[PDB]
Amino acid sequence: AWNRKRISNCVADYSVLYNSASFSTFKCYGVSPTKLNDLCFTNVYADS
Amino acid sequence: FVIRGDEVRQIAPGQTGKIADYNYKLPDDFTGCVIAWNSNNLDSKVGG
Numbered sequence: 741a742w743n744r745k746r747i748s749n750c751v752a753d754y755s756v757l758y759n760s761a762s763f764s765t766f767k768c769y770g771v772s773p774t775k776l777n778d779l780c781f782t783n784v785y786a787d788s
Numbered sequence: 789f790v791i792r793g794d795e796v797r798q799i800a801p802g803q804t805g806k807i808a809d810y811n812y813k814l815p816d817d818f819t820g821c822v823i824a825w826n827s828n829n830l831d832s833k834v835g836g
């Protein structure tokens with residue numbers, strides 16, 4: 741059972757998600773993480 | 789140099805991680821061989 745918390749209409753950031761919590765694994769598919777700041781996506785979905 | 793076993797994967801061509809991206813980064817065209825081996829006895833003491 742998973743929850744799609746759909747995200748829309750705001751301004752994100754991802755550098756903050758690199759140091760505060762030292763994640764065990766971080767595998768950015770189809771997109772090199774470091775460049776996530778400088779492009780605008782469509783209809784981001786989160787799963788948990 | 790000596791780094792922990794978990795970060796051994798990080799020290800390789802085209803890989804991410806804190807030390808790899810902040811301390812020592814291998815070039816993409818690297819043509820060499822990397823060697824690793826524990827020395828626990830040498831890295832263990834009474835006073836640490």
Ligand SMILES: *[C@@H]1O[C@H](CO)[C@@H](O[C@@H]2O[C@H](CO)[C@@H](O)[C@H](O)[C@H]2NC(C)=O)[C@H](O)[C@H]1NC(C)=O
Binds near residue numbers: 759760761
């Ligand atoms: C969830 O955890 C993160 C840490 O991974 C929290 O981020 C910290 O929050 C405090 C309070 O705002 C800041 O002082 C710290 O600077 C943040 N950590 C770092 C390293 O900067 C975050 O607040 C937590 N979120 C929730 C909703 O509880």
